[PDB]
Design a protein around this ligand. Structure first.
Ligand SMILES: [Cl-]
Ligand SMILES: [Cl-]
Ligand SMILES: [Cl-]
Lengths: 189, 189
C-alpha cells in the first residue's frame, strides 16, 4: 500500500510513456492495479484527469533532477558533462520517454502542459547558465544556453529510441563522443 | 488495387502520425478512404502490415529530402542555409510526427525500425559533410557535422510538439532564426 491514488498514477506514467494518451485505455490502467474500471472513479473523475496528474508527476521528477544538480556540481566546464548525462540518462528512463509522449496530449488541454514545458525549459536554461564562463567560452551566454538546450533536445528522442530498441550502451557511447565535440566547439583554446 | 493500396498507406500515415499505432483503428483507416473495412484486407492482412508499410513510406519521404538536395545543391554556404531552411519549413508535419510516433510502436513489432532511424541519421550526416569547407567554417569537420545534426535532430521534437502546443509555422520561423544565429558564429565565409 498504502495509497491507491498514487499506485494508479505510478502505473499510469508507465502505460502513458509506452503507448501515449490515445493508446492507453482506462482498462489498461485498471488492470495494472487489479481493480475494476469503475473503481478508478474512486480516485479520479476521468482518463484526462489521470493523465494530467501523471504529467505533473513527470515534470516534478524532471524539475527535481535540475534542482538537485547544485548538491552535486562545482559548475566547472568539467561538471557540465555529468549534468547533461544525468538529465538524458536518468536512472528512471520512463520520465524522458513520457516527456516525448507529451506530443500526443489531447490538443484539448495543451495549455497547461505547454506552460510546464516552458517552465522546465526556463529552469534548464538557468542551470546551464551557471556553467557559463565568459573568459573560457567563445560565444555569448545566450548562445551557449541555446546551443546546450538544442543539444539536449536532440537527445530526448535519441535516448528514448535507444531505450525502446535496447541499444542503450551504444547510445551512451555516442553521447559521450558528442559532448566531447560540444565542449570543443564552444571552449576557447 | 495498387492505387488503393497507395491511398490507404498515405491516409494511414496521417492517422498514425496523429494517434500512433494503438490509438489508430482499422475502422479509422477505412473511413479515411471511404471503403468498407473488409476492403482493407484486399490489400493488407492486418493493422500491423499497414503500419509497417506506412513507416517505410515515411522513411522513403524523409530520405528523399537528401536525394533532392544532391540533385540541385552546389554545396556552398548559401546552399547550406537553404538546406537548413528546407529541412525546417518543407518537411511536411505528418512525417515528422510519424517519426516521433515510432516511440509507441508495440514491442512485438519493433521490426527494422531502429535500423531505419539510424540509417536516416547516417545519411543526413554524410550529406551534411559535403557542405564542409575548410576556408569558410571555423570548425573541424567532426564538429561541423555534429552541430548541423543537432539542429536537424532537435527539430523533430519541436515540430511534433508545435502541432499540439501553439503554431507549426511560427515554430519553423523561430527555430530557423535560432539555428541561423548559432551557425553564423562559425562562419569566416
Ligand atoms: Cl479505491
Ligand atoms: Cl545530437
Ligand atoms: Cl521566416
Amino acid at each position: 500500500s498504502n495509497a491507491m491514488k498514487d499506485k494508479i498514477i505510478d502505473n499510469a506514467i508507465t502505460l502513458f510513456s509506452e503507448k501515449g494518451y490515445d493508446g492507453t485505455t482506462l482498462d489498461d490502467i485498471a488492470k495494472s492495479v487489479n481493480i475494476k474500471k469503475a473503481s478508478l472513479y474512486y480516485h479520479f473523475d476521468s482518463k484526462k484527469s489521470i493523465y494530467e496528474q501523471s504529467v505533473k508527476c513527470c515534470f516534478d521528477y524532471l524539475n527535481n533532477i535540475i534542482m538537485m544538480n547544485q548538491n552535486k556540481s562545482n559548475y566547472s566546464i568539467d561538471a557540465l558533462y555529468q549534468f547533461l548525462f544525468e538529465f538524458i540518462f536518468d536512472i528512471e528512463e520512463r520520465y524522458i520517454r513520457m516527456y516525448v509522449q507529451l506530443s500526443n496530449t489531447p490538443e484539448e488541454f495543451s495549455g497547461n502542459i505547454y506552460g510546464q514545458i516552458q517552465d522546465l525549459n526556463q529552469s534548464l536554461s538557468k542551470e546551464i547558465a551557471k556553467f557559463y564562463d565568459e573568459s573560457k567560452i567563445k560565444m555569448t551566454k545566450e548562445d551557449f544556453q541555446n546551443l546546450i538546450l538544442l543539444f539536449l533536445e536532440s537527445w530526448y528522442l535519441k535516448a528514448s529510441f535507444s531505450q525502446k530498441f535496447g541499444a542503450v550502451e551504444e547510445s551512451k557511447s555516442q553521447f559521450k563522443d558528442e559532448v566531447y565535440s560540444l565542449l570543443n566547439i564552444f571552449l576557447k583554446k
